[PDB]
Amino acid sequence: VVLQRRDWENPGVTQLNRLAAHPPFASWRNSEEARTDRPSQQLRSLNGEWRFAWFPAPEAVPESWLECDLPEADTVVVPSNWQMHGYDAPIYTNVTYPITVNPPFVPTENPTGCYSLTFNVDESWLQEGQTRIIFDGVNSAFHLWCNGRWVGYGQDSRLPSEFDLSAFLRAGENRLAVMVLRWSDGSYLEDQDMWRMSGIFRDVSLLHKPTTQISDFHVATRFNDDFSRAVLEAEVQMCGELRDYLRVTVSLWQGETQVASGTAPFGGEIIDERGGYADRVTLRLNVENPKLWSAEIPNLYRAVVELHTADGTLIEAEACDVGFREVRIENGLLLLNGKPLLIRGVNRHEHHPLHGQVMDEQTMVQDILLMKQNNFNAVRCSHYPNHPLWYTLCDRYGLYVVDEANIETHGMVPMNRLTDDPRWLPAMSERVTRMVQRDRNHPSVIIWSLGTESGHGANHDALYRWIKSVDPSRPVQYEGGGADTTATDIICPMYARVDEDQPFPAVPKWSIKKWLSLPGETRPLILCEYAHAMGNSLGGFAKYWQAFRQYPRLQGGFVWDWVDQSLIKYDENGNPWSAYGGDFGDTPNDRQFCMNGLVFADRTPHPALTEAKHQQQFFQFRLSGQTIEVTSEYLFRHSDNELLHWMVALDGKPLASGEVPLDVAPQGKQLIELPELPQPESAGQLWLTVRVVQPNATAWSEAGHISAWQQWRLAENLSVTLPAASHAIPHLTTSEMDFCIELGNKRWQFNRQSGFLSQMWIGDKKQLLTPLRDQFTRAPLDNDIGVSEATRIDPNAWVERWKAAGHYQAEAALLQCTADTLADAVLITTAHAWQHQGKTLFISRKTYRIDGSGQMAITVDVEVASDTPHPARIGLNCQLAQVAERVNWLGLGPQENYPDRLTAACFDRWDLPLSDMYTPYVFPSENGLRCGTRELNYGPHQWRGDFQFNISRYSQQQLMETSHRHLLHAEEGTWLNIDGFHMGIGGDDSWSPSVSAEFQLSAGRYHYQLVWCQK
Amino acid sequence: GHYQAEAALLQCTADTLADAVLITTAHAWQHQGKTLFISRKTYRIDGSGQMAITVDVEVASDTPHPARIGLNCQLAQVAERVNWLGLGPQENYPDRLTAACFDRWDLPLSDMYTPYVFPSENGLRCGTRELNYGPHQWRGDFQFNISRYSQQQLMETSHRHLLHAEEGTWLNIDGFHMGIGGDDSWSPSVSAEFQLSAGRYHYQLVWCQK
Ligand SMILES: O=C1O[C@H](CO)[C@H](O)[C@H](O)[C@H]1O
Ligand SMILES: [Mg+2]
Ligand SMILES: [Mg+2]
Ligand SMILES: [Mg+2]
Ligand code: NA
Ligand code: NA
Ligand code: NA
Ligand code: NA
Ligand code: NA
């Protein structure tokens, strides 16, 4: 029957004998345990060691397994993904389905996971009441047997499947048999851009309920106009035999104080001609001056639901955390408790580099802490309902949650092929309805989502309306079919740009500013995905936040995304390395496109995270003369854990500093008058830095946490006092092959064949391993390569334009090399043309002036042909002989920063170990740049000017040739790249050119100057 | 003190090279102890008769962004025609140059002055690679205006009919020039991208006879 029915190739059958979905139950038999959320004896975990066997298809599974353990089976930890234990390969594919597109059919070669457990059940559990098993997550489908008898079937990998085992179990030893199919008709609705895995990957538990039971409960909170009064409404449903002596009590607690309570027998109000629900009751509780829930202040009450007899005998209790909050869209704005939200959000997949898609509390808490510490207030459950603990943690720590149905059909052609088909409506409906039934009592969930990338079908419209009707308390959004369909309350585009339109046929991505005011449009706009954080990215991030702040109806967005989906593999010595698509022999695959995070898989931050933190700051600053104006972007809280630190420095040297407590109302302003600053003696630029510090520890941060910062240039005193001229004179030595400059025992060698500084000497010590040459190229970033799929060679991508123009192949042709003696210096003049097959790309004209103080002043003027693609950089490079420990600079830092991603960086004197000047992006590229640098120090060298630089043991050539960071080898000496100019990194998306015009090197003529000397 | 600032000489040296003479200068413009601007220049005169001028200007970050960064002189020549390779033929400024076309233009000198009834800076042409006036040629990438009226006369005079042709021809060659604005005329209306706020400025010019 089981093999005959092939229920996993039938979208009409998504379950057999599965129990109704409901909010989290524990069946407490002690009311205080319910109140305080203590563990319940009636809720047992079946997590731990199970037996597992892998088969190539369900037809390969022996019958004996239903009744007896397989001797060849292994013992494994559950929850797990079986790919993580090495039974088969995890597959990374983005859009293209991992199986042949032939709905509802799946491959006959269908990897099958045979899980089994021998466990004890106590007689007391079977003598009365109901014993159910709960599978929180099984990917992608499964049949269940108990003691050899078939129980049921379940689909949807991301919601719990529950089955009544009361009639199947015996006192003492029992055996479960679970056949998990990797592929099913459900897989057609699970085409998320992530690793494709399978198995029992979330918790398994047993729950005992009395026969007469709480089967469901819904909690609503409604408010008067000023939120000074609320009504808590609790609808409660029972199963079992109705009796007149039955009662429901709902009590509401704040800490240990009961603030409200109501008791009633069952029997709802009249609903229609046939009466009412005899098996339901609604309790209404008045609450004066409720403490309101937000991500700012996550105030929680506790609601306890008791099923009992009239004379006071408890049957059972259930409970939940209640957050008093109202979510509504009014006049085109998303409001929480009457105030317009600004969503500082991120998309977060459930991913662990070791455990795959198994989630644990420690990782969840770590993510939330890092999110809040980096000024995020919101998370999107991309693209499925999460592990149930996630919502509990969001309720308590305070994050706004978009809860999303497990529906994505991206690989369909067209994208709505299934979602417009009424045959797929039952399967889609269960993915929506069972999510709502499970999560509707969590205050952190403020918005429902119908899924992602499934086009726009009639099924979406039906399900949009179902939610609107069943739960009016939360807006519904959905991006498919152009982000502004009739199935969404919120314009929710993915990677729509700030100012630039992308007018795709049918589904255009308008400039977000333009989108709001399209004829007849009135809704708020919140990007469900933006600022694609793939590799060296988040260029232009500040542009989004300026617009978010300027436009009331631009209420923010969710960054794509939180965490790199890299996996751990090991070399022959057992050293772990980060793997991406293809590294497991998985094919076809989409390579590094699984790594889009602000953090590495182990939760180490990418440089881009600090840019996000800074732009998402909750305090805004303006300076006018002596006065700092601080504006609060909090909606609900006063600044009661904040003080403003200010410091004034002259070129990194502290001049004055001080503290002022912040006392700003939500949305308010505070004016801070700085004292008289003593005028500095020496020349240079004064810089003002302010930082907002939290003196007191919180649930989410340590004492001293910095939440906000800003910098201004103050007075500048230009250097006019010409330095006292040294008495020494450099000498020019000319041969046919070289111009050599000598000062004391210092030597500068210029090759006359090549026209470059080929060597420098301090006495007998060599300074260079490679000559100092112009560089116009970078090892391509993921945004430069610009493909979302591995098999696309895209002529429009920046890298392809550079390659085809001959940028990486360009050979230097010497046009001029002369040497002149001056009164106090030697002057070397050079010109070079870079050409590709007859075409001049760039011309570089230089002068090197070596004076008696041993300073080499390099002047560089570059012409760039207007018809060549704008170069990635305009600078110089060389391999230095020296390897030093520290890197010291006056400029923007301390972290990596690029022209379109440097707002978070501060101007000061920074000093880091050399290793910190390299960013270990799993896919290697140009990295570690620091901009607006006036002085750089390394070993015996000092460079002064106004440049961008990076410095590392890896050449641009190695970086562009190597696919994985673990494969990189330190080279002899140190590679230095000093740029007059560097192109933006972009990142609005990573599959089309995304570097904004103002960050492209398009000026045609460029000038920069450097001084190289010994320090 | 932008209109009051006097040039103070910091450096003036001359070196003889293989086929050229190199003059190096440095000036600071100060107002009541405050250094507004620093100009550093080299003039390279070679055997072909060309003078290559390299100009590097520092602008104090806390002084109001300057109206222009350039050079001026009164030429002795009064010639009938002005010939340039650049944007034109009409007056155009950095934030008002979209209508202008790049080409070889040739106009009578009088067309290089715009007779605004209230006199001001006028007649600029941008994106110019070559300018010809009498025996003179200037090459580079610059903005220029050229007329019988000095900037001083224009700012001192209230009505265009009160202007008088001065002895030679005033030439203003700018490396950089501020936007003119106009979103309104009663508050600062020049957009940030057209203000001269970069702090350090570089331009180069070749002056020769044709
Ligand atoms: O539009 C999207 O872009 C991302 C690219 O990495 C990723 O595929 C998301 O799941 C998808 O919603
Ligand atoms: Mg099915
Ligand atoms: Mg997708
Ligand atoms: Mg715990
Ligand atoms: Na806004
Ligand atoms: Na991705
Ligand atoms: Na405070
Ligand atoms: Na690479
Ligand atoms: Na005037």
Coordinates of N, CA and C in Angstrom, one line a residue, chain A residues 9-175:
Chain A
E9 N 4.5 11.6 -4.6 CA 4.3 12.1 -6.0 C 2.9 12.5 -6.3
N10 N 2.3 13.1 -5.2 CA 0.9 13.5 -5.3 C 0.7 14.7 -4.5
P11 N 0.5 15.9 -5.1 CA 0.4 17.2 -4.4 C -1.0 17.2 -3.7
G12 N -1.9 16.3 -4.0 CA -3.2 16.2 -3.3 C -3.0 15.6 -1.9
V13 N -2.0 14.8 -1.7 CA -1.7 14.2 -0.5 C -0.5 14.8 0.2
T14 N -0.7 15.6 1.2 CA 0.4 16.3 1.8 C 0.6 15.7 3.2
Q15 N -0.4 14.9 3.6 CA -0.3 14.2 4.9 C -1.4 13.1 5.0
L16 N -1.1 12.1 5.8 CA -2.1 11.1 6.2 C -2.1 11.0 7.7
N17 N -3.3 11.1 8.3 CA -3.5 11.0 9.8 C -2.7 12.0 10.6
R18 N -2.3 13.1 10.0 CA -1.7 14.2 10.8 C -2.7 15.0 11.6
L19 N -2.3 15.3 12.8 CA -3.2 16.1 13.7 C -3.2 17.6 13.3
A20 N -4.2 18.3 13.7 CA -4.3 19.7 13.5 C -3.1 20.5 14.1
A21 N -2.7 21.5 13.3 CA -1.7 22.4 13.8 C -2.2 23.3 14.9
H22 N -1.3 23.9 15.8 CA -1.7 24.6 16.9 C -0.5 25.3 17.5
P23 N -0.7 26.3 18.4 CA 0.4 26.9 19.1 C 1.2 26.0 20.0
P24 N 2.4 26.4 20.4 CA 3.2 25.5 21.2 C 2.5 25.0 22.5
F25 N 2.4 23.7 22.6 CA 1.8 23.0 23.8 C 2.8 22.4 24.7
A26 N 2.5 22.3 26.0 CA 3.4 21.5 26.9 C 2.5 20.6 27.9
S27 N 1.2 20.9 27.9 CA 0.3 20.1 28.7 C 0.7 20.1 30.2
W28 N 1.0 21.3 30.8 CA 1.3 21.4 32.2 C 0.1 20.9 33.0
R29 N 0.4 20.2 34.1 CA -0.6 19.8 35.1 C -0.4 20.5 36.4
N30 N 0.4 21.6 36.3 CA 0.7 22.5 37.4 C 0.7 23.9 36.9
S31 N -0.2 24.7 37.4 CA -0.5 26.1 36.9 C 0.7 27.0 37.0
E32 N 1.4 26.9 38.1 CA 2.6 27.7 38.4 C 3.8 27.3 37.4
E33 N 3.8 26.0 37.0 CA 4.8 25.6 36.0 C 4.5 26.3 34.6
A34 N 3.2 26.4 34.4 CA 2.7 27.1 33.2 C 3.1 28.6 33.2
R35 N 2.8 29.2 34.3 CA 3.1 30.6 34.5 C 4.6 31.0 34.3
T36 N 5.5 30.2 34.9 CA 6.9 30.5 35.0 C 7.7 29.8 33.8
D37 N 6.9 29.1 32.9 CA 7.5 28.4 31.8 C 8.6 27.4 32.1
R38 N 8.3 26.6 33.2 CA 9.2 25.5 33.6 C 9.0 24.4 32.7
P39 N 10.0 23.4 32.6 CA 9.8 22.2 31.9 C 8.5 21.4 32.3
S40 N 7.9 20.7 31.3 CA 6.8 19.9 31.6 C 7.1 18.4 31.5
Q41 N 6.7 17.7 32.6 CA 6.8 16.2 32.6 C 6.0 15.6 31.4
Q42 N 5.0 16.2 31.0 CA 4.1 15.8 29.9 C 4.7 16.0 28.5
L43 N 5.8 16.7 28.4 CA 6.5 17.0 27.1 C 7.9 16.4 27.2
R44 N 8.1 15.3 26.6 CA 9.4 14.5 26.6 C 10.2 14.7 25.3
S45 N 11.5 14.9 25.3 CA 12.3 15.0 24.1 C 12.8 13.6 23.7
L46 N 12.7 13.3 22.4 CA 13.2 12.0 21.9 C 14.5 12.3 21.1
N47 N 15.1 13.5 21.3 CA 16.4 13.8 20.7 C 17.5 12.9 21.3
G48 N 18.6 12.7 20.6 CA 19.7 11.9 21.0 C 20.1 10.9 20.0
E49 N 20.6 9.7 20.4 CA 21.0 8.7 19.5 C 19.9 7.9 19.0
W50 N 19.9 7.8 17.7 CA 18.9 7.0 16.9 C 19.7 6.0 16.1
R51 N 19.0 5.1 15.4 CA 19.6 4.2 14.4 C 19.2 4.7 13.0
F52 N 20.2 4.7 12.1 CA 20.0 5.2 10.8 C 20.6 4.3 9.7
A53 N 19.9 4.1 8.6 CA 20.4 3.4 7.4 C 20.0 4.2 6.2
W54 N 21.0 4.3 5.2 CA 20.7 5.0 4.0 C 20.4 4.1 2.8
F55 N 19.4 4.4 2.1 CA 19.0 3.6 0.9 C 18.9 4.5 -0.4
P56 N 19.1 3.9 -1.6 CA 19.1 4.8 -2.8 C 17.6 5.1 -3.2
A57 N 16.7 4.3 -2.8 CA 15.3 4.5 -3.1 C 14.4 3.8 -2.1
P58 N 13.1 4.2 -1.9 CA 12.2 3.5 -1.0 C 11.9 2.1 -1.3
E59 N 12.0 1.7 -2.6 CA 11.9 0.3 -3.0 C 13.0 -0.6 -2.5
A60 N 14.1 0.0 -2.1 CA 15.3 -0.7 -1.7 C 15.2 -1.0 -0.2
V61 N 14.3 -0.5 0.6 CA 14.1 -0.7 2.0 C 13.5 -2.1 2.3
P62 N 14.3 -2.9 3.1 CA 13.7 -4.2 3.4 C 12.6 -4.1 4.4
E63 N 11.6 -5.1 4.3 CA 10.4 -5.2 5.1 C 10.7 -5.4 6.6
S64 N 11.8 -6.1 6.8 CA 12.2 -6.5 8.2 C 12.6 -5.3 9.1
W65 N 12.9 -4.2 8.4 CA 13.2 -2.9 9.1 C 12.0 -2.3 9.9
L66 N 10.8 -2.6 9.5 CA 9.6 -2.2 10.2 C 9.5 -2.8 11.6
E67 N 10.0 -4.0 11.7 CA 9.9 -4.7 13.0 C 11.2 -5.0 13.7
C68 N 12.3 -4.9 13.0 CA 13.6 -5.2 13.6 C 14.7 -4.2 13.1
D69 N 15.6 -3.9 14.1 CA 16.8 -3.1 13.8 C 17.6 -3.7 12.7
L70 N 18.1 -2.9 11.7 CA 19.0 -3.4 10.7 C 20.4 -3.5 11.3
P71 N 21.1 -4.7 11.2 CA 22.5 -4.9 11.7 C 23.5 -3.9 11.0
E72 N 23.2 -3.6 9.8 CA 24.1 -2.7 9.0 C 23.9 -1.2 9.3
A73 N 22.8 -0.9 10.0 CA 22.5 0.5 10.4 C 23.5 1.1 11.3
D74 N 23.7 2.4 11.3 CA 24.6 3.1 12.2 C 23.8 3.8 13.3
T75 N 24.5 4.2 14.4 CA 23.9 5.0 15.4 C 24.3 6.4 15.3
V76 N 23.3 7.3 15.1 CA 23.6 8.7 14.8 C 22.8 9.6 15.7
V77 N 23.3 10.9 15.8 CA 22.5 11.9 16.6 C 21.4 12.5 15.8
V78 N 20.2 12.6 16.4 CA 19.0 13.3 15.8 C 18.7 14.4 16.8
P79 N 18.4 15.6 16.3 CA 18.2 16.0 14.9 C 19.5 16.1 14.2
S80 N 19.5 15.8 12.9 CA 20.6 16.0 12.0 C 20.2 16.0 10.5
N81 N 21.0 16.5 9.6 CA 20.9 16.3 8.2 C 21.9 15.1 7.9
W82 N 21.4 14.1 7.1 CA 22.3 13.0 6.8 C 23.5 13.3 5.9
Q83 N 23.4 14.4 5.2 CA 24.5 14.9 4.4 C 25.7 15.3 5.3
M84 N 25.3 15.8 6.5 CA 26.4 16.3 7.4 C 27.1 15.1 8.1
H85 N 26.6 13.9 8.0 CA 27.2 12.7 8.5 C 27.9 12.0 7.4
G86 N 27.8 12.5 6.2 CA 28.5 12.0 5.0 C 27.8 10.8 4.2
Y87 N 26.5 10.6 4.5 CA 25.8 9.5 3.8 C 25.6 9.8 2.3
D88 N 25.2 11.0 2.0 CA 25.3 11.5 0.6 C 25.7 13.0 0.5
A89 N 25.8 13.6 -0.7 CA 26.3 14.9 -0.8 C 25.2 16.0 -0.6
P90 N 25.5 17.0 0.1 CA 24.6 18.2 0.1 C 24.7 18.9 -1.3
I91 N 23.6 19.4 -1.8 CA 23.7 20.1 -3.1 C 23.4 21.6 -3.0
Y92 N 24.3 22.4 -3.5 CA 24.0 23.8 -3.6 C 23.6 24.2 -5.0
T93 N 22.3 24.5 -5.1 CA 21.8 25.1 -6.3 C 20.9 26.3 -6.0
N94 N 21.0 27.3 -6.8 CA 20.2 28.6 -6.5 C 18.8 28.5 -7.1
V95 N 18.6 28.6 -8.4 CA 17.3 28.7 -9.0 C 16.9 27.3 -9.6
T96 N 17.8 26.7 -10.4 CA 17.5 25.5 -11.1 C 17.3 24.4 -10.0
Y97 N 16.1 23.7 -10.1 CA 15.8 22.6 -9.3 C 16.8 21.5 -9.3
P98 N 17.1 20.9 -8.1 CA 18.1 19.8 -8.0 C 17.6 18.5 -8.7
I99 N 16.3 18.5 -9.0 CA 15.7 17.4 -9.7 C 15.1 17.8 -11.0
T100 N 15.0 16.9 -12.0 CA 14.3 17.2 -13.3 C 12.9 17.8 -13.0
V101 N 12.6 18.9 -13.7 CA 11.3 19.5 -13.5 C 10.2 18.8 -14.3
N102 N 9.5 17.9 -13.5 CA 8.5 17.1 -14.1 C 7.4 16.9 -13.1
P103 N 6.7 18.0 -12.6 CA 5.8 17.9 -11.5 C 4.6 17.0 -11.8
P104 N 4.1 16.2 -10.9 CA 4.6 16.1 -9.5 C 5.6 15.0 -9.2
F105 N 6.2 14.5 -10.3 CA 7.2 13.4 -10.2 C 8.6 13.7 -9.7
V106 N 9.2 12.8 -9.0 CA 10.6 12.9 -8.5 C 11.4 11.8 -9.0
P107 N 12.8 11.9 -8.9 CA 13.6 10.8 -9.4 C 13.2 9.4 -8.8
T108 N 13.3 8.4 -9.6 CA 13.2 7.0 -9.0 C 14.4 6.7 -8.1
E109 N 15.5 7.3 -8.4 CA 16.7 7.3 -7.5 C 16.4 8.4 -6.4
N110 N 15.8 8.0 -5.3 CA 15.4 9.0 -4.3 C 16.0 8.6 -3.0
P111 N 17.1 9.3 -2.6 CA 17.8 8.9 -1.4 C 16.8 8.9 -0.2
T112 N 16.9 7.8 0.5 CA 15.9 7.4 1.5 C 16.6 7.2 2.9
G113 N 16.2 7.9 3.9 CA 16.8 7.8 5.2 C 15.9 7.0 6.2
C114 N 16.4 5.9 6.6 CA 15.7 5.0 7.5 C 16.1 5.3 8.9
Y115 N 15.3 6.1 9.6 CA 15.5 6.4 11.0 C 14.7 5.5 11.9
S116 N 15.3 5.0 13.0 CA 14.6 4.2 14.0 C 15.0 4.5 15.4
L117 N 14.0 4.3 16.4 CA 14.3 4.5 17.8 C 13.6 3.5 18.6
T118 N 14.3 2.9 19.5 CA 13.8 2.0 20.6 C 13.8 2.9 21.9
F119 N 12.6 3.1 22.4 CA 12.5 3.9 23.6 C 11.4 3.3 24.6
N120 N 11.5 3.8 25.8 CA 10.5 3.4 26.8 C 9.3 4.3 26.9
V121 N 8.2 3.7 27.1 CA 7.0 4.5 27.4 C 6.4 3.9 28.7
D122 N 6.1 4.8 29.7 CA 5.6 4.4 30.9 C 4.1 4.1 30.8
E123 N 3.6 3.1 31.5 CA 2.2 2.6 31.5 C 1.2 3.8 31.8
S124 N 1.6 4.7 32.7 CA 0.8 5.8 33.1 C 0.4 6.7 31.9
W125 N 1.2 6.8 30.9 CA 1.0 7.5 29.7 C -0.1 6.9 28.8
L126 N -0.3 5.6 29.0 CA -1.2 4.8 28.1 C -2.5 4.5 28.8
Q127 N -2.6 4.5 30.1 CA -3.8 4.2 30.9 C -4.9 5.2 30.7
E128 N -4.5 6.4 30.5 CA -5.4 7.5 30.2 C -4.8 8.6 29.3
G129 N -5.7 9.4 28.7 CA -5.2 10.5 27.8 C -4.7 10.1 26.5
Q130 N -4.0 11.0 25.9 CA -3.5 10.9 24.5 C -2.0 11.2 24.4
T131 N -1.3 10.2 23.8 CA 0.1 10.4 23.6 C 0.4 10.6 22.1
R132 N 1.0 11.8 21.8 CA 1.3 12.1 20.4 C 2.8 12.3 20.2
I133 N 3.3 12.0 19.0 CA 4.6 12.3 18.7 C 4.7 13.6 17.8
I134 N 5.7 14.4 18.0 CA 5.8 15.6 17.3 C 7.2 15.7 16.6
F135 N 7.2 15.8 15.2 CA 8.3 16.0 14.4 C 8.4 17.4 14.0
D136 N 9.2 18.2 14.6 CA 9.3 19.7 14.3 C 9.8 20.0 12.9
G137 N 10.6 19.1 12.4 CA 11.1 19.3 11.0 C 11.7 18.0 10.4
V138 N 11.0 17.6 9.3 CA 11.5 16.4 8.5 C 11.5 16.8 7.1
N139 N 12.7 16.7 6.4 CA 13.0 17.1 5.1 C 13.2 15.9 4.1
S140 N 12.3 15.7 3.1 CA 11.2 16.6 2.7 C 9.8 15.9 2.9
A141 N 9.8 14.6 3.1 CA 8.6 13.8 3.4 C 9.0 12.6 4.1
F142 N 8.0 12.0 4.8 CA 8.2 10.8 5.6 C 7.0 10.0 5.8
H143 N 7.1 8.6 5.9 CA 6.2 7.7 6.5 C 6.6 7.3 7.9
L144 N 5.7 7.1 8.8 CA 5.9 6.7 10.2 C 5.3 5.4 10.5
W145 N 6.0 4.5 11.1 CA 5.5 3.3 11.7 C 5.8 3.3 13.2
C146 N 4.9 2.6 14.0 CA 5.2 2.4 15.4 C 4.9 1.0 15.8
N147 N 5.9 0.3 16.3 CA 5.9 -1.1 16.6 C 5.4 -2.0 15.4
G148 N 5.8 -1.5 14.2 CA 5.5 -2.2 13.0 C 4.2 -1.8 12.3
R149 N 3.4 -1.1 12.9 CA 2.1 -0.6 12.3 C 2.3 0.8 11.8
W150 N 1.7 1.0 10.6 CA 1.8 2.3 9.9 C 0.9 3.3 10.6
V151 N 1.5 4.5 10.9 CA 0.8 5.5 11.6 C 0.3 6.6 10.6
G152 N 1.2 7.2 9.9 CA 0.9 8.2 8.9 C 2.0 8.8 8.1
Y153 N 1.7 9.9 7.5 CA 2.6 10.5 6.4 C 2.6 12.1 6.6
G154 N 3.7 12.7 6.3 CA 3.7 14.2 6.4 C 4.6 14.8 5.3
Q155 N 4.2 16.0 4.9 CA 5.0 16.9 4.0 C 5.2 18.3 4.6
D156 N 5.9 19.2 4.0 CA 6.4 20.5 4.5 C 7.5 20.3 5.5
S157 N 8.7 20.6 5.0 CA 9.9 20.3 5.8 C 10.1 21.3 7.0
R158 N 9.3 22.3 7.1 CA 9.6 23.4 8.0 C 8.5 23.7 9.1
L159 N 7.5 22.8 9.2 CA 6.5 22.9 10.2 C 6.3 21.5 10.9
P160 N 5.9 21.5 12.2 CA 5.8 20.2 12.9 C 4.7 19.3 12.3
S161 N 5.0 18.0 12.3 CA 4.0 17.0 11.9 C 3.8 16.2 13.2
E162 N 2.5 16.1 13.6 CA 2.1 15.5 14.8 C 1.1 14.3 14.5
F163 N 1.3 13.2 15.3 CA 0.5 12.0 15.1 C 0.1 11.4 16.4
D164 N -1.1 10.9 16.6 CA -1.6 10.3 17.8 C -1.1 8.9 17.8
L165 N -0.3 8.5 18.8 CA 0.3 7.2 19.0 C -0.4 6.4 20.1
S166 N -1.5 6.9 20.6 CA -2.1 6.3 21.8 C -2.5 4.8 21.6
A167 N -3.0 4.4 20.4 CA -3.4 3.1 20.1 C -2.2 2.2 19.6
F168 N -1.1 2.8 19.4 CA 0.1 2.1 18.8 C 1.1 1.6 19.8
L169 N 1.2 2.3 20.9 CA 2.2 2.1 21.9 C 1.8 1.0 22.9
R170 N 2.9 0.4 23.5 CA 2.7 -0.6 24.6 C 3.5 -0.1 25.8
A171 N 3.1 -0.5 27.0 CA 3.9 -0.3 28.2 C 5.3 -0.9 28.0
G172 N 6.3 -0.1 28.4 CA 7.7 -0.6 28.2 C 8.4 -0.2 26.9
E173 N 9.0 -1.1 26.3 CA 9.9 -0.9 25.1 C 9.0 -0.8 23.8
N174 N 9.3 0.3 23.0 CA 8.6 0.6 21.8 C 9.6 0.9 20.7
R175 N 9.2 0.7 19.4 CA 10.1 1.1 18.3 C 9.4 1.9 17.2

